[PDB]
Amino acid sequence: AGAAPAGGEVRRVTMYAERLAGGQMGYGLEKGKASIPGPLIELNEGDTLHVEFENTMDVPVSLHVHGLDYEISSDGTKQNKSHVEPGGTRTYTWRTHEPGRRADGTWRAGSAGYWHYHDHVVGTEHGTGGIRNGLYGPVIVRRKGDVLPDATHTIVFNDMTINNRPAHTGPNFEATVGDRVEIVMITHGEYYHTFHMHGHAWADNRTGMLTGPDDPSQVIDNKICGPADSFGFQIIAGEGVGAGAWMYHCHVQSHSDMGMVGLFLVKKPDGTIPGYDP
Amino acid sequence: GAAPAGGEVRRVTMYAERLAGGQMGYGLEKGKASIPGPLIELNEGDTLHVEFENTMDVPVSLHVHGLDYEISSDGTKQNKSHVEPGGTRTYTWRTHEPGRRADGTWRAGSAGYWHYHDHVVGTEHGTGGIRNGLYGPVIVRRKGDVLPDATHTIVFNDMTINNRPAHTGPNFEATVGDRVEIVMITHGEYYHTFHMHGHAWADNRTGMLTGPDDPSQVIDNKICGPADSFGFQIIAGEGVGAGAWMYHCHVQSHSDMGMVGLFLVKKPDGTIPGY
Amino acid sequence: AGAAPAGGEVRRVTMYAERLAGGQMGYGLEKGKASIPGPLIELNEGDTLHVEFENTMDVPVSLHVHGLDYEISSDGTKQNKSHVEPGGTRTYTWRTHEPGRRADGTWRAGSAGYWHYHDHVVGTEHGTGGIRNGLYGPVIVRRKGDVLPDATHTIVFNDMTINNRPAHTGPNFEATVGDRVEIVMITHGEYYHTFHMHGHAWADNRTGMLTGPDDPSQVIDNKICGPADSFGFQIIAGEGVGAGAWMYHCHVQSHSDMGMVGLFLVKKPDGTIPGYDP
Numbered sequence: 063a064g065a066a067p068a069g070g071e072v073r074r075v076t077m078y079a080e081r082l083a084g085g086q087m088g089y090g091l092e093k094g095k096a097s098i099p100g101p102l103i104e105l106n107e108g109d110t111l112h113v114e115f116e117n118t119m120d121v122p123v124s125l126h127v128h129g130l131d132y133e134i135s136s137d138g139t140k141q142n143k144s145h146v147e148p149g150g151t152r153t154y155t156w157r158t159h160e161p162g163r164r165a166d167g168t169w170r171a172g173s174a175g176y177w178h179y180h181d182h183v184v185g186t187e188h189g190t191g192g193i194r195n196g197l198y199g200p201v202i203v204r205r206k207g208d209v210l211p212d213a214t215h216t217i218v219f220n221d222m223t224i225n226n227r228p229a230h231t232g233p234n235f236e237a238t239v240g241d242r243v244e245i246v247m248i249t250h251g252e253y254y255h256t257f258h259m260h261g262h263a264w265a266d267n268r269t270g271m272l273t274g275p276d277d278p279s280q281v282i283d284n285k286i287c288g289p290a291d292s293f294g295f296q297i298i299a300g301e302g303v304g305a306g307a308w309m310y311h312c313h314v315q316s317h318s319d320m321g322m323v324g325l326f327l328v329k330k331p332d333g334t335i336p337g338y339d340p
Numbered sequence: 341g342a343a344p345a346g347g348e349v350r351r352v353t354m355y356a357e358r359l360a361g362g363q364m365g366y367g368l369e370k371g372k373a374s375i376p377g378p379l380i381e382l383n384e385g386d387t388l389h390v391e392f393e394n395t396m397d398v399p400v401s402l403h404v405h406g407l408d409y410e411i412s413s414d415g416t417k418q419n420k421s422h423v424e425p426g427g428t429r430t431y432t433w434r435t436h437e438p439g440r441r442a443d444g445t446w447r448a449g450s451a452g453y454w455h456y457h458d459h460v461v462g463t464e465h466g467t468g469g470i471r472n473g474l475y476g477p478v479i480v481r482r483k484g485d486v487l488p489d490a491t492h493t494i495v496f497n498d499m500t501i502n503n504r505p506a507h508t509g510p511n512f513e514a515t516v517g518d519r520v521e522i523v524m525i526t527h528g529e530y531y532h533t534f535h536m537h538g539h540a541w542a543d544n545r546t547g548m549l550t551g552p553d554d555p556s557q558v559i560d561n562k563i564c565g566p567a568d569s570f571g572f573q574i575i576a577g578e579g580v581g582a583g584a585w586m587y588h589c590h591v592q593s594h595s596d597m598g599m600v601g602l603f604l605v606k607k608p609d610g611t612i613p614g615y
Numbered sequence: 616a617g618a619a620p621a622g623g624e625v626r627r628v629t630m631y632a633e634r635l636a637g638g639q640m641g642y643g644l645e646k647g648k649a650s651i652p653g654p655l656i657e658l659n660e661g662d663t664l665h666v667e668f669e670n671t672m673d674v675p676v677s678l679h680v681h682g683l684d685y686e687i688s689s690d691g692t693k694q695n696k697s698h699v700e701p702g703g704t705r706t707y708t709w710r711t712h713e714p715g716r717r718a719d720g721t722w723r724a725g726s727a728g729y730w731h732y733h734d735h736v737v738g739t740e741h742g743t744g745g746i747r748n749g750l751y752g753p754v755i756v757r758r759k760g761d762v763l764p765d766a767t768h769t770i771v772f773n774d775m776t777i778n779n780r781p782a783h784t785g786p787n788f789e790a791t792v793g794d795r796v797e798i799v800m801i802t803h804g805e806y807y808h809t810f811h812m813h814g815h816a817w818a819d820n821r822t823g824m825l826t827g828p829d830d831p832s833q834v835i836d837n838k839i840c841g842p843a844d845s846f847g848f849q850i851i852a853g854e855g856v857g858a859g860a861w862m863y864h865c866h867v868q869s870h871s872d873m874g875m876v877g878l879f880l881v882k883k884p885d886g887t888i889p890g891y892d893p
């Protein structure tokens with residue numbers, strides 16, 4: 063349960079770019095604890111986040127965010143001289159805003175949504191190598207009153223992997239029937255995909271939930287998405303369908319056949335998953 | 341008219357058969373398998389028990405998008421709810437209306453344009469069965485939804501429409517004024533862009549704006565990928581009159597290679613001008 | 616903020632198809648002034664446009680429009696024998712309508728939206744050769760009260776080009792901070808793309824702007840699109856982010872690396888751009 067508070071706090075966080083095993087690179091909030099996808103960044107509309115960023119690698123890296131407000135000096139592009147030299151540090155500043163009525167009378171949308179950050183300088187001047195190595199992460203910006211979940215899982219379709227994992231190796235995620243589960247879904251690389259969840263549908267809008275009986279957003283369980291698209295939704299685990307090993311996968315047929323599959327294990331209260339047998 | 345509130349327990353029997361030259365299909369009676377398979381329509385609240393029978397020499401399953409089912413009705417080998425050659429099984433699909441949850445949020449109803457397909461032929465994601473023609477449309481209506489005079493199903497399965505040979509349509513006929521409903525499904529390996537000459541729709545659940553407050557983009561072109569489903573209703577010839585109105589994938593090599601047909605909109609006397 | 620009036624005017628223009636340098640083809644409103652993309656046609660909901668069209672080329676060409684009302688006589692296809700022979704002429708007629716309640720109580724959508732026109736006859740019966748050559752252009756149909764921009768810019772992703780240009784030639788677009796800028800984005804050809812704008816987001820709906828605090832459309836800065844997709848939006852240039860050279864690009868990694876990139880040059884009031892090299 064819960065709802066998002068009105069935002070406006072100034073926050074600081076340490077971020078590191080680190081080599082990981084397998085030629086992979088990752089972001090982390092703590093030295094030695096980088097992860098792919100990188101750490102989830104949660105902000106409420108109006109918050110400011112000062113990211114004290116350190117590049118612990120032997121090659122330049124950058125941090126570039128979708129959707130938030132930044133001045134060009136926190137762009138994370140080499141083109142604007144906001145990348146980070148090997149061993150260097152720099153403070154990237156992100157700002158967010160509430161919606162509101164402009165003086166001209168139009169409506170200014172807020173920053174709330176499902177967003178992401180990624181490298182922009184490794185391999186190419188668009189971060190093609192660093193994205194491919196794992197330098198991407200989720201950003202959620204909440205509007206005041208937004209329903210909060212019991213858990214949030216990030217699913218990144220990165221070329222032909224999920225979260226840079228080997229073919230047919232999840233990730234799986236667990237919930238109990240009735241848990242309010244939040245999915246952040248991000249795509250990267252060269253390929254278009256279609257993201258599909260067995261047993262669970264969501265609304266194709268900002269929060270993934272219909273606002274009420276007046277909301278005309280299509281209700282879907284299958285969504286085409288391409289490089290750098292990002293969306294999210296919230297579902298009630300097992301709602302209307304019960305416990306089980308509920309597949310999610312890319313529905314591009316060869317993509318699922320070659321490994322782009324994982325499991326949303328929905329448990330009964332006693333912890334069991336009927337008919338689940340790997 | 342419009343659609344009623346649902347809550348009926350419906351039954352249907354569905355067969356999977358082989359068809360000419362390696363294709364495979366679903367049907368309501370044997371020897372009558374079609375590609376795409378039979379349209380299933382429900383009202384939110386309805387339950388459907390599909391008495392399924394596999395008539396083929398290989399396993400098959402029935403898996404549906406969007407509807408409520410238990411893990412036992414998955415239609416996946418993974419959960420052992422596939423059907424062995426010659427075997428039978430009853431799949432149960434449920435639907436629900438929208439309403440406020442216990443937690444105060446709004447729960448979406450089942451209404452939408454959906455589809456069902458095989459999941460075990462060729463691969464454990466049904467790649468061979470989908471290619472062969474094992475897919476069909478499902479419509480679930482909300483109470484009050486306007487009913488059409490006709491419903492046509494267009495599936496973009498890899499480089500074909502409805503598994504037909506290149507440059508063979510299908511065409512669909514209507515008369516000016518008809519309320520024409522289109523179920524559009526995509527399957528296989530390619531993205532596509534579905535496009536209709538002369539008619540636009542709203543990019544929302546019904547394909548029609550709710551009213552003057554519906555901000556949905558109005559479009560005549562929509563990108564879709566494998567297992568995307570959507571639908572819409574148009575008044576044929578509205579504002580444009582009768583004639584042979586093209587629809588096609590708008591990916592240029594795709595239309596060029598034959599993903600194209602004609603929506604033949606007839607004058608009340610039955611003649612299509614310029615055709 | 617100035618607004619679109621109600622429509623209902625009958626407008627007339629002349630349009631020519633002409634060969635252009637580099638084995639190209641384009642539309643223009645005056646002989647010898649064709650461009651790629653073709654001239655922007657703007658209509659108010661309910662206006663009619665009669666296009667006095669001439670084919671100055673040695674192959675059949677045509678004019679086909681998305682989104683607008685036309686009879687098969689102006690369909691623009693060899694199917695409905697509405698193409699234009701070499702040297703020939705023809706008058707194409709487009710109509711638009713306002714929205715309203717039908718007899719049966721259902722709501723008829725207006726013509727308002729971001730649309731486009733292209734050839735349908737060169738190369739094949741689907742205009743593949745014409746579209747590749749540059750026979751395409753934008754159409755904006757405005758609804759009464761729609762907010763009017765200070766400038767409109769058309770970005771067409773045509774196969775692996777922007778506006779048929781060579782790789783890494785932009786185009787760039789200039790604005791001043793505070794300007795209300797309108798983007799028209801059209802895709803053509805064989806491939807999918809994902810349009811991305813640095814520092815500026817918009818609403819995934821008809822206008823690119825949220826109606827108010829009840830509009831649930833997702834706010835995005837990244838959007839997958841395929842051949843003959845069209846959408847548009849207005850942004851306040853630099854809002855929340857400030858002046859600077861703001862990148863836009865296809866976010867498919869190999870597409871950006873290979874030059875599907877341009878610049879949204881947002882200038883301070885004095886015309887300078889921080890950190891940019893003119």
Ligand SMILES: [Cu+2]
Nearest residue numbers: 188813862864
């Ligand atoms: Cu970028």
Ligand SMILES: [Cu+2]
Nearest residue numbers: 255312314317
């Ligand atoms: Cu995929």
Ligand SMILES: [Cu+2]
Nearest residue numbers: 259260404405
């Ligand atoms: Cu499914």
Ligand SMILES: [Cu+2]
Nearest residue numbers: 128180290866
């Ligand atoms: Cu990006």
Ligand SMILES: [Cu+2]
Nearest residue numbers: 260309311465
């Ligand atoms: Cu599946």
Ligand SMILES: [Cu+2]
Nearest residue numbers: 532589591594
């Ligand atoms: Cu296609």
Ligand SMILES: [Cu+2]
Nearest residue numbers: 536537680681
């Ligand atoms: Cu068209």
Ligand SMILES: [Cu+2]
Nearest residue numbers: 313405457567
């Ligand atoms: Cu499926």
Ligand SMILES: [Cu+2]
Nearest residue numbers: 537586588735
């Ligand atoms: Cu066409």
Ligand SMILES: [Cu+2]
Nearest residue numbers: 808865867870
């Ligand atoms: Cu591209």
Ligand SMILES: [Cu+2]
Nearest residue numbers: 127128812813
């Ligand atoms: Cu960006």
Ligand SMILES: [Cu+2]
Nearest residue numbers: 590681733843
């Ligand atoms: Cu077209």
